């Protein structure tokens, strides 16, 4: 199996972590999807990472689909419950976390445009999406919808999203008055799979 | 059940069509997610439509998750196969179609920014994503991975994506030398569910 990705993408990281947790052997194929010359299109016409390539040449995308493919392999530890509705509820929370990643990425890409081309309004509305979403996550933990010791596809995705926010310096107050969220991501960050997949920083 | 949406969004339209096809009663709650004052955040902290609200107050997002929720209700006609791997393969194709919508939407939002803030490079790379993706879709139909008479979640999504491209006047050559794709979407557009969900045009 090949995982086509970048070293910074949290969508990719989510999958690297699933595979590492499950002890599944894979080769990483590094790509830079925002350069003009890159090699992503042979794997995904959308030009986005991650992509998973099976040992028959089938290319899987986007990241939630790949995570389900991996789950279907049936290798411990399970990262989704077996019950269809509860699995879908975990995957709704994964979609929330993926949306935090999306908003972080939009923010970073906005700031990569030439100065005169940037929209401060765009930055503000992405930041608001992030804060509202972090509030919903804290609420799940207050309510017991999530627990701080939960390790599943949703919580992996949440910690990847927060790790990305930190890395890119988006929403520096993510931890302010969200103490359950802090505990949850610290618990995940302590795992070897997170330690081995940190984004490179100069 | 409530479907929170806009009248133009193809992500929303995909779900309106599923519900209509299945004869499932719902109320539509219209929202404008790009205005500064809107009502989407009470349903989804990401501030995006669609959202599905159940008759207990649970809010489901994003669109692929909602489509699976609907499928889980087990109401004819089925829009996903029962086998887990083949269902996931249909959902991979749905992800491709959703990515075409994404690229179309990025294009439209780019063109909504003030003139001096626009990136022609951004427009070009979204257009290329679209063309490459349309080529993959045509290839699926040549290979028999899809058929022109296939009616499932993936092909609904494909026709919603193409309908959006047409509506927004993105990728006007989508039909050029993609005759299977043309036939597939014309077959879907002929259905009442598509006729009743067309985007408003002045
Ligand atoms: N919906 C996709 C989003 C993936 C995504 O946005 N990946 C970024 C890197 S973090 C990418 O490849 N961007 C290139 C582009 O948008 O052209 C998923 O969940 O995998
Ligand atoms: N991943 C989402 C994407 C939904 C989406 O992009 N919806 C657009 C309307 S077509 C939206 O609500 N945009 C508001 C925003 O991005 O702030 C899905 O599949 O539902």
Domains held by chain B: number: 2
Same domain flag for B61 and B103: no
Sheet arrangement for strand A27-30:
A27-30, A2-5, A51-53, A59-60
- The two structure tokens encoding residue B68: 């699976």
Same domain flag for B171 and B106: yes
Give me the CATH number covering residue A141.
1.20.1050.10
Ligand 2 atom at minimum distance from B6 CA = 9
Same domain flag for B109 and B40: no
Give resolution, Å, one decimal: 1.0
**Which structural technique was applied?**
X-ray
On the 0-12 / 13-18 / 19+ scale of CB atoms within 10 A, A159 is buried
Same domain flag for A115 and A33: no
Separation CA B89–CA B81 (nearest Å): 10
Q: Chain A contact for B133, CB < 8 A?
A: yes
Domain that holds residue A183: 79-191
Same domain flag for B130 and B45: no
Separation CA B154–CA B133 (nearest Å): 14
B107 close to ligand 2 (CB < 6 Angstrom): no
Residues in CB range of A79: below 8 A, 6 or more apart:
A18, A21, A22, A67, A70, A71, A151, A152, A153, A156
Same domain flag for B47 and B91: no
Same domain flag for A183 and A91: yes
The SS3 assignment for B44 reads coil
Pairing of strands A59-60, A27-30: unpaired
Q: Chain B contact for A68, CB < 8 A?
A: yes
* 3-state DSSP of A139-158: HHHHHCCCCCCCCCHHHHHH
Pairing of strands A51-53, A27-30: unpaired
Nearest CA in chain A to B115: A117
The SS3 assignment for A166 reads helix
Give me the CATH number covering residue B19.
3.40.30.10
Q: Facing residues of B28 across strands?
A: B3
For A88, A97, A185, A199, the CA distances from A154, given in Å and listed in that order, are 10, 7, 12, 20
| Start-to-end CA span in chain B (Å) | 30
A71 close to ligand 1 (CB < 6 Angstrom): no
Same domain flag for A26 and A98: no
Separation CA B47–CA A127 (nearest Å): 11
Q: Is A136 in contact with A161 (CB distance < 8 Å)?
A: no
Q: H-type helices in chain A, by residue range?
A: 10-21, 63-72, 84-112, 120-143, 153-168, 179-189, 192-195
Separation CA B60–CA B50 (nearest Å): 9
Q: What is the CA radius of gyration of chain A?
A: 17
Same domain flag for A91 and A186: yes
Q: Is A108 in contact with A168 (CB distance < 8 Å)?
A: yes
- A125: which chain B residues are within 8 Å (Cβ-Cβ)? 47
For A23, A24, A64, A195, the CA distances from A76, given in Å and listed in that order, are 8, 10, 18, 20
């Amino acid at each position: 199996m090949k995982l086509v990705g970048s070293y910074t993408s949290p969508f990719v990281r989510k999958l690297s972590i699933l595979l590492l947790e499950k002890g599944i052997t894979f080769e990483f194929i590094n790509e830079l999807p925002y350069n003009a010359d890159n090699g992503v299109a042979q794997f995904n016409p959308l030009g986005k990472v991650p992509v998973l390539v099976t040992e028959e040449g089938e290319c899987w995308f986007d990241s939630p689909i790949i995570a389900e493919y991996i789950e279907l392999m049936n290798v411990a530890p399970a990262m989704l419950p077996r019950d269809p509705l509860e699995s879908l509820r975990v995957r709704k929370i994964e979609a929330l976390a993926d949306g935090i990643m999306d908003a972080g990425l939009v923010s970073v890409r906005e700031q990569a445009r030439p100065a005169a081309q940037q929209s401060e309004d765009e930055l503000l509305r992405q930041r608001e999406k992030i804060n509202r979403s972090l509030d919903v996550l804290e609420g799940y933990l207050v309510d017991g919808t999530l627990k701080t010791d939960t390790v599943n596809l949703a919580t992996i995705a949440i910690a990847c999203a927060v790790g990305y926010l930190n890395f890119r310096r988006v929403a520096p107050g993510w931890c302010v008055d969200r103490p359950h969220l802090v505990k949850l991501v610290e618990n995940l960050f302590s795992r070897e799979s997170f330690a081995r997949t940190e984004p490179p920083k100069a």
